[PDB]
Structure 1
Amino acid sequence: GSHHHHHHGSHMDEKLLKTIAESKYLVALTGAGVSAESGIPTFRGKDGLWNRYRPEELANPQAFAKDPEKVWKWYAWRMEKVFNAQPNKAHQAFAELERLGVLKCLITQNVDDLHERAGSRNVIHLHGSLRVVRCTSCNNSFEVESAPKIPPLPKCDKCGSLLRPGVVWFGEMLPPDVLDRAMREVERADVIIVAGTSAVVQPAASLPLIVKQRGGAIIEINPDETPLTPIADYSLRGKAGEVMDELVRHVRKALS
């Protein structure tokens, strides 16, 4: 509260750089903001296509069950834009930090494939991916090179059923193995960069808490303050592209 202020560093000072450079097991958690600079806007409450629905009204199993064509029209639109988008400076910076051996694992809530395309090897998709198309009925699953044309609904060539985007919607359990991996990674982390996320959607929002409780540091990068700020050792108000870019440069120099 106003009588319970917790203060955090707000600059790229030497202590911050020292915390990242000297970390023994640094990980990252990214949200949609990390791709905003690649041409993929955060939804800010509107579906972005028809602009009459909150995203949650479409990224939902009930909604999909009720109107597969509408939900698929939305995802094919998202897919095409993501597939044609390019990794930004943030994506590249995360890949770089991993190349440098500092970043151990990147957990992302994003369903885009920009971290991979930037070169990040160790990525956990907490909420699935737009690259994956899977069956609603059997276990058939595969990756696509392009968005499907939705005049006809995509159907599984194994069981004939309706295929769906390989993402996790609200009301759906995350894949157990994926969740397990994410937990073990943060239970192992001494430092965590949390960039481009509103820090409200669970359980992703809680991952930084685990690092915190085990004595690790939290480094938040967001142009906005979030429910996580009060517990962040550092909260930097800026775009992930500019901030991560500056961050990796300095870490790069100091790491030599």
Structure 2
Amino acid sequence: MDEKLLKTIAESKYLVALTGAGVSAESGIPTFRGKDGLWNRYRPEELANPQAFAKDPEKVWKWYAWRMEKVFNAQPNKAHQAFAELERLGVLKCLITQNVDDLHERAGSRNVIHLHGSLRVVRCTSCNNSFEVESAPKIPPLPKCDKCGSLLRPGVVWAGEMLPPDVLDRAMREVERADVIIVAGTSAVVQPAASLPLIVKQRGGAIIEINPDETPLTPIADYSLRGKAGEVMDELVRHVRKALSLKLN
């Protein structure tokens, strides 16, 4: 947290961010990997997989209904608020997230790309129909599509499935125009999300990583703040706002 870092952010021409589950940990939502990580307890192959869903839809839906209620009842934390503020200040141009929660939106973020879908979305397994929910469904019974005759599924992307072409393309266009990218709360192992910060770097841009742990991205991160996103982003945006207020215009 030096003056060079604050300058890099405050004077950026097109700053973007890539966030992961770590930015929602301080809202009481568990991460997937690391301490208390969901994948250290549960098995992805049995809960977040198309095969697992076809094998036991009730088991998968009960788990997601639980995840949904938790997220819908959680509140955005200081990290979410900071990203929203950085956007309000006109510094953050776009926020790309791997999170399926809607905490960035509830904090006020306007330009958000959801690479892996959203828990607010439910879609049909057969026909092209999807919609958003206000609260979690009760399981059983299994959610069915009213349009046709098939089951509904959470509108998130599971391992092995393809991200919507337009979603990845939009995210790529954003990082291709960015000179600075803040990468917060992500383990940097899941693709293609993990490759996005590399585009910024290969283009001569700067990477600012915020994570209490080192990741595969750390070696190339211009700055890597070993702390919690809530504390780090709050202080960061506070300093950035002060810097911007001093600008002669």
What TM bracket, shorter-length normalisation? over 0.9
The corresponding residue for 1:8 is: none
Query: Could you tell me whether the CA contact under 8 Å between 2:182 and 2:208 is conserved in 1?
Result: yes
- How many percent identity over aligned positions? 100
How far does the alpha carbon of each residue in 1:105-143 deviate from its partner, in whole angstroms, 9 at most, with x for none?
A: 000000000000000000000000000000000011000
Please state how far the C-alpha of 1:151 moved relative to its aligned partner.
1.3
Rate the CA distance shift 1:34–1:51 in 2: closer, same or farther, 3 A: closer
Please state how far the C-alpha of 1:192 moved relative to its aligned partner.
0.1
For normalisation by structure 1, the TM-score amounts to 0.93
Rate the CA distance shift 1:45–1:155 in 2: closer, same or farther, 3 A: farther
Rate the CA distance shift 1:122–1:15 in 2: closer, same or farther, 3 A: same
SS at match of 1:35: helix
Rate the CA distance shift 1:52–1:87 in 2: closer, same or farther, 3 A: closer
Tell me which protein shows more helix as a share of its residues. Answer: 2
For normalisation by structure 2, the TM-score amounts to 0.95
Rate the CA distance shift 1:77–1:50 in 2: closer, same or farther, 3 A: farther
Query: Could you tell me whether the CA contact under 8 Å between 1:33 and 1:197 is conserved in 2?
Result: yes
Please state how far the C-alpha of 1:46 moved relative to its aligned partner.
9.7
**In the aligned structure 1, how far is the partner of 2:221 from the partner of 2:41?**
35
**In the aligned structure 1, how far is the partner of 2:22 from the partner of 2:40?**
19
Q: Which runs of 5+ in 2 are unaligned?
A: none
Rate the CA distance shift 1:48–1:75 in 2: closer, same or farther, 3 A: farther
**In the aligned structure 2, how far is the partner of 1:127 from the partner of 1:235?**
25
**In the aligned structure 1, how far is the partner of 2:36 from the partner of 2:139?**
18
Rate the CA distance shift 1:190–1:28 in 2: closer, same or farther, 3 A: same
Q: Which of 234-243 and 42-51 deviates more?
A: 42-51
Please state how far the C-alpha of 1:160 moved relative to its aligned partner.
1.7
Query: Could you tell me whether the CA contact under 8 Å between 1:125 and 1:178 is conserved in 2?
Result: yes
Count of residues paired in the alignment: 245
Query: Could you tell me whether the CA contact under 8 Å between 2:19 and 2:186 is conserved in 1?
Result: yes
Query: Could you tell me whether the CA contact under 8 Å between 1:45 and 1:55 is conserved in 2?
Result: no
Please state how far the C-alpha of 1:58 moved relative to its aligned partner.
1.1
Please state how far the C-alpha of 1:50 moved relative to its aligned partner.
11
Rate the CA distance shift 1:211–1:156 in 2: closer, same or farther, 3 A: same
Q: Which runs of 5+ in 1 are unaligned?
A: 1-11
- State which of 5, 21, 25 in structure 2 corresponds to 1:36: 25
Rate the CA distance shift 1:49–1:222 in 2: closer, same or farther, 3 A: closer
Please state how far the C-alpha of 1:100 moved relative to its aligned partner.
0.3
Rate the CA distance shift 1:56–1:233 in 2: closer, same or farther, 3 A: farther
The runs of 4+ residues in structure 1 deviating greater than 6 Å are: 45-51
Please state how far the C-alpha of 1:200 moved relative to its aligned partner.
0.3
Please state how far the C-alpha of 1:181 moved relative to its aligned partner.
0.2
